[PDB]
């Protein structure tokens, strides 16, 4: 399957369909090959771990942060996450943000929507068998069996294990089968060093937590479809396989989060805004070593005392610890026969994992491997560069890793998985455009 | 390296991946077959492969 | 060319470059600048210039990477440096 | 010679000398020095001591 063939077939597929403006594409570039992306953004992404309540709880700080980050290099941020940018679009649309960033987000999201529409178009509706929709029987991005690399609420798993019903499913979560998915974990039950197979589903905005209440998905069916298409298209579309996914360590992360140096402002006086005032949180007289304020000041971002106080409400809900999820399935009825039942497929994914843009190893501000440990599970997301963050990093491992993507067997062998090496080669070595590459990859996924 | 699938060992994935890392140091006795995808059609269809 | 020395000049190096592109001469300071002096404290155009230069360098490194095959080393020496001097540790910068 | 004081480390006198950077340091520095710099100078720059 020549690369030129893939590009041309994508070009045909993207004949009359939408494309991004040069502004958006150059912005997303400037973002991704910027190694100087401040890590505190990853920190807040991890701590909120895609909870809609968490997002709704931090309006002011988030808007001021994205503002100051953009009106300093015209670079957009937060791009990797699936469950924040659309949260911005849903909520941060009154007009408070600069029109350029929100327009970029709108353009990219409706482009993703048009990709979904394209997948709808080139299939025929009305052809179901054994309870499977034609959409799922044609493409893999629409089959709820296949999952995204990163999952933060078990709703996708709920869709998966309600969907197949004929494919024999098997889920391994640190050995023993099955999950429990206890939601809305507090301070009194943090247990960062917890070994059980429970899952953190989050706090639904409109509902009652309870204890015997059965788990409820936080979103609809096609939310997962958008997640899968976004992850498997746009990120490979721009990173060109440079990015990587990995886990975090809340046991050391959370303790660093309490350092708040907000001053007890005198009552009924206007809050300082410019950083030059010692009363301002960003000012040096309120700058103390080993604190969140210096973490921000490294990124040179102006923030207000109330926004920093908002973290005290933020710590209402905790995130327990990253884990590995292995899902196995049989081929669907489209390829179901007497000899392929045992002939199954497996896939590994990260729960509460996170993806960073470009590996960096040359900063004195933060030591190596302080918060994150590089755990990629994808031929697509191979990150031989990121492996330098791993403890006990040697030379032989690095030199041999350039020519093989290291994926642990408990996370999925390449041959038995969906994404194989050749498509990774294609996405990493096709240098034609970006919209064309998006369409080519999308067309591949049949 | 490309056919074997293991199970979770009830850990924080820190020790797991690290141990897998040194294990992968000597697990490779030769060049894996699925690495030379950069080859074009010709030498691929050549009888040597 | 020592980062301990570099990380103590933030202020003065900021004002000098802001008043003045410069300091493009040797490797042992430009990428340090983009590593630490790289959050927009300076006028953004210079940051773009430095970023473009460094990404160009690593892109050329990618070029030298993909134009050789991997996994053939001898005498305990890596495959890729068997392609070019610029990739071989035996060679030294001037 | 002078190695320059390491940032994250311990001073010592008998403590063995340690590199300040990884292997990509050398290749990136070499590429930067021998390619873009001459292409920008065309042999107009010069190297001298202090």
C-alpha A257/C-alpha A59 separation (Å) is 18
**Is residue A190 a contact partner of residue A318, using CB atoms and an 8 Å limit?**
yes
Containing B26, the helix (H) or strand (E) segment is helix B14-26
- Beta bridge partners of residue C54, listed in sequence order: none
* Nearest-neighbour CA in chain C from B39: distance (Å): 9
Residue C28 sits at the vertex; the CA angle it makes with C22 and C30, to the nearest 5 degrees, is 35
Instruction: Say how many Å lie between the first and final Cα of chain D, rounded.
Output: 15
A51 exposure class (CB count in 10 Å sphere: 0-12, 13-18, 19+):
buried
Q: For tokens 């068997």, what's the residue? A: C82
User: How crowded is residue D30: how many other Cβ atoms within 10 Å of its Cβ?
Assistant: 22
Q: For tokens 């269809």, what's the residue? A: B45
Torsion, CA A43, CA A45, CA A47, CA A50, rounded to 10: -170
* 3+ Cβ–Cβ pairs closer than 8 Å linking D and B: no
Pairing of strands A244-248, A170-173: unpaired
Is D28 touching C (CB cutoff 8 A)? yes
Q: Which residues in chain A are closer than 8 Å to C35, comparing Cβ atoms?
A: 35-36, 360, 362-363
List, in sequence order, the alpha helices (H) in A14-144: 22-32, 39-48, 52-57, 59-73, 85-91, 99-121, 134-138
Is C66 touching B (CB cutoff 8 A)? yes
Q: Which residues in chain C are closer than 8 Å to B35, comparing Cβ atoms?
A: 70-71
Q: Which chains touch D (3 or more CB pairs under 8 A)?
A: A, C
Q: For tokens 């940051």, what's the residue? A: C47
**Is residue A92 a contact partner of residue A103, using CB atoms and an 8 Å limit?**
no
Contact C71 B31 (CB under 8 A): yes
Residues whose CB is less than 8 angstroms from the CB of residue A422 and which lie 6 or more positions away in sequence, other chains included? A1, B37
C-alpha A35/C-alpha C4 separation (Å) is 21
Contact A367 D21 (CB under 8 A): no
Q: Which of C1, C61, C94 sits opposite D27 (nearest CB)?
A: C61
Torsions phi, psi for A64 (to 5 deg): -65, -35
**Is residue A418 a contact partner of residue A146, using CB atoms and an 8 Å limit?**
yes
* Nearest-neighbour CA in chain A from D27: distance (Å): 14
| 3 state DSSP class of D22 | coil
C-alpha A174/C-alpha B13 separation (Å) is 9
| 3 state DSSP class of A117 | helix
Contact A72 C40 (CB under 8 A): yes
C-alpha D3/C-alpha B11 separation (Å) is 41
**Is residue A134 a contact partner of residue A123, using CB atoms and an 8 Å limit?**
yes
Torsions phi, psi for A337 (to 5 deg): -145, 175
User: How crowded is residue A399: how many other Cβ atoms within 10 Å of its Cβ?
Assistant: 17
Question: Angle between the A59-73 and A305-314 helix axes, to the nearest 10 degrees?
Answer: 130
C-alpha C18/C-alpha D9 separation (Å) is 33
Pairing of strands A244-248, A372-373: antiparallel
Q: What is the CA radius of gyration of chain C?
A: 17
C-alpha A444/C-alpha A1 separation (Å) is 10
Residue of A nearest to C63 (CA): A429
Q: Which of D5, D20, D27 sits opposite C86 (nearest CB)?
A: D27
User: How crowded is residue C61: how many other Cβ atoms within 10 Å of its Cβ?
Assistant: 17
For residue A232, give Cα distances in angstroms to A29, A98, A144, A185, A352. Answer: 17, 29, 14, 31, 18
Is B9 touching A (CB cutoff 8 A)? yes
C-alpha A173/C-alpha A164 separation (Å) is 19
Question: Angle between the A22-32 and A99-121 helix axes, to the nearest 10 degrees?
Answer: 100
Torsions phi, psi for A418 (to 5 deg): -75, -65
Half-sphere exposure of A73 (CA within 13 A, CB side): 27
C-alpha A85/C-alpha A229 separation (Å) is 15
| 3 state DSSP class of C79 | coil
Torsions phi, psi for A105 (to 5 deg): -60, -45
Alpha carbon A200 to its chain's center = 16
**Is residue A190 a contact partner of residue A209, using CB atoms and an 8 Å limit?**
no
**Is residue A394 a contact partner of residue A387, using CB atoms and an 8 Å limit?**
no
Q: DSSP character for C4?
A: H
Is B12 touching A (CB cutoff 8 A)? yes
C-alpha C90/C-alpha C81 separation (Å) is 9
Residue of C nearest to A300 (CA): C39
Mutate to test the interface with B, among C70, C74, C80, C83 (most CBs of B within 10 A): C70
Q: For tokens 């029987």, what's the residue? A: A137
Helix/strand/coil (H, E, C) string of A194-254? CCCCCCCCCCCCCCCCCCCCCCCCCCCHHHHHHHHHHHHHHHHHHHCCCCEEEEECHHHHH
Longest Cα pair distance anywhere in chain A, in angstroms?
78
Residues 36-75 of A with CB under 8 A from C: 36, 38, 72-74
Q: What is the CA radius of gyration of chain B?
A: 16
Alpha carbon A207 to its chain's center = 25
Residues whose CB is less than 8 angstroms from the CB of residue A266 and which lie 6 or more positions away in sequence, other chains included? none
C-alpha A17/C-alpha A112 separation (Å) is 11
C-alpha A56/C-alpha A60 separation (Å) is 10
Q: Which chains touch B (3 or more CB pairs under 8 A)?
A: A, C
Exposure pattern of A3-26 as b/e (b: 16+ CB <10 Å)?
eeebbebbbebbeeeebbeeebbe
Alpha carbon B20 to its chain's center = 12
Contact B21 A172 (CB under 8 A): no
C-alpha A223/C-alpha A176 separation (Å) is 29
Q: For tokens 């993806």, what's the residue? A: A355
Q: DSSP character for A266?
A: P
Q: What is the CA radius of gyration of chain A?
A: 23
Containing A327, the helix (H) or strand (E) segment is strand A323-329
User: How crowded is residue A444: how many other Cβ atoms within 10 Å of its Cβ?
Assistant: 17
Contact B9 A174 (CB under 8 A): yes
Residue of A nearest to C69 (CA): A403
Instruction: Say how many Å lie between the first and final Cα of chain C, rounded.
Output: 15
**Is residue A407 a contact partner of residue A416, using CB atoms and an 8 Å limit?**
no
Is B4 touching A (CB cutoff 8 A)? yes
C-alpha A242/C-alpha C58 separation (Å) is 12
Half-sphere exposure of A190 (CA within 13 A, CB side): 13
Half-sphere exposure of D15 (CA within 13 A, CB side): 10
Residues 358-387 of A with CB under 8 A from D: 361-362, 364, 367
Q: Which residues in chain D are closer than 8 Å to A367, comparing Cβ atoms?
A: 8
SS3 content of chain A, % helix, strand, coil (to 5): 40, 5, 50
Contact A402 C80 (CB under 8 A): yes
C-alpha A397/C-alpha B21 separation (Å) is 8
Q: Which residues in chain A are closer than 8 Å to D7, comparing Cβ atoms?
A: 364
Q: Which residues in chain B are closer than 8 Å to A403, comparing Cβ atoms?
A: 35
Q: DSSP character for A342?
A: S
Residue of C nearest to A30 (CA): C48
Is A414 touching B (CB cutoff 8 A)? yes
**Is residue A224 a contact partner of residue A144, using CB atoms and an 8 Å limit?**
yes
List, in sequence order, the alpha helices (H) in D1-50: 23-31, 37-41
Containing A395, the helix (H) or strand (E) segment is helix A395-401
- Beta bridge partners of residue A244, listed in sequence order: A356
Instruction: Say how many Å lie between the first and final Cα of chain A, rounded.
Output: 14
Containing A354, the helix (H) or strand (E) segment is strand A354-356
Contact B17 A403 (CB under 8 A): no
């Amino acid at each position: 399957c020549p690369i030129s063939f893939r590009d041309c077939r994508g070009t045909q597929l993207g004949l009359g369909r939408h494309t991004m403006t040069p502004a958006t594409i150059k912005a997303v570039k400037d973002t991704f090959e910027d190694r100087a992306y401040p890590t505190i953004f990853y920190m807040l992404e991890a701590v909120i771990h895609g909870n809609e309540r968490n997002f709704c709880a931090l309006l002011r700080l988030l808007t001021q942060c994205i503002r100051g980050y953009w009106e300093q290099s015209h670079r957009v941020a937060f791009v990797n996450n699936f469950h924040m940018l659309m949260y911005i679009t849903t909520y941060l649309g009154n007009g408070e943000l600069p029109e350029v960033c929100i327009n970029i987000y709108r353009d990219l999201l409706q482009h993703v929507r048009a990709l979904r529409q394209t997948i709808t178009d080139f299939t025929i509706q009305g052809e179901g068998h054994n309870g499977e929709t034609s959409e799922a029987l044609n493409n893999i991005l629409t089959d709820d069996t296949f999952i995204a690399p990163i999952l933060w609420d078990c709703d996708a798993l709920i869709y998966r294990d309600e969907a197949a019903r004929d494919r024999l499913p098997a889920i391994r979560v640190s050995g023993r089968n099955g999950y429990q998915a206890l939601h809305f974990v507090d301070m009194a039950g943090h247990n960062f060093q917890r070994r059980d197979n429970v899952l953190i589903h989050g706090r639904p905005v409109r509902g009652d937590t309870g204890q015997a209440i059965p788990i409820t998905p936080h979103h609809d069916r096609e939310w997962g479809i958008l997640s899968k298409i976004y992850y498997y298209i746009v990120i490979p579309a721009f990173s060109r396989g440079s990015c990587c996914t990995m886990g975090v360590r809340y046991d050391r992360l959370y303790p660093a989060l309490q350092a708040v140096i907000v001053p007890e402002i005198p009552a009924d006086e206007e809050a300082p805004t410019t950083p030059e005032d010692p009363r301002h949180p960003l000012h040096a007289h309120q700058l103390v070593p080993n604190s969140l304020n210096v973490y921000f000041h490294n990124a040179h971002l102006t923030v207000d005392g109330d926004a920093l106080l908002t973290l005290q409400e933020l710590m209402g809900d905790m995130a327990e610890r990253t884990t590995a999820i292995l899902v196995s399935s049989a081929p669907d009825a489209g390829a179901a026969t007497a000899t392929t039942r045992n002939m199954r497929i497996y896939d590994g994914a990260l729960y509460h994992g996170l993806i960073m843009m470009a590996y960096q190893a040359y900063d004195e501000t933060i030591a190596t491997g302080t918060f994150f440990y590089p755990v990629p599970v994808n031929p697509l997301f191979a990150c031989p560069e990121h492996l330098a963050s791993l403890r006990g990093m040697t030379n032989a491992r690095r030199v041999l890793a350039k020519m093989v993507p290291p994926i642990p067997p408990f996370l999925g062998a390449n041959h038995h998985a969906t994404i194989r090496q050749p498509v990774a080669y294609h996405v990493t070595h096709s240098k034609s455009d970006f919209n064309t590459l998006t369409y080519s990859l999308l067309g591949g996924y049949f | 390296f490309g056919v074997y699938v293991a199970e979770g060992t009830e850990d924080t994935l820190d020790v797991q991946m690290g141990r897998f890392m040194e294990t992968w140091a000597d697990m490779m006795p030769h060049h894996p077959h699925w690495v030379n995808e950069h080859l074009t059609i010709l030498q691929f269809i050549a009888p040597s492969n």
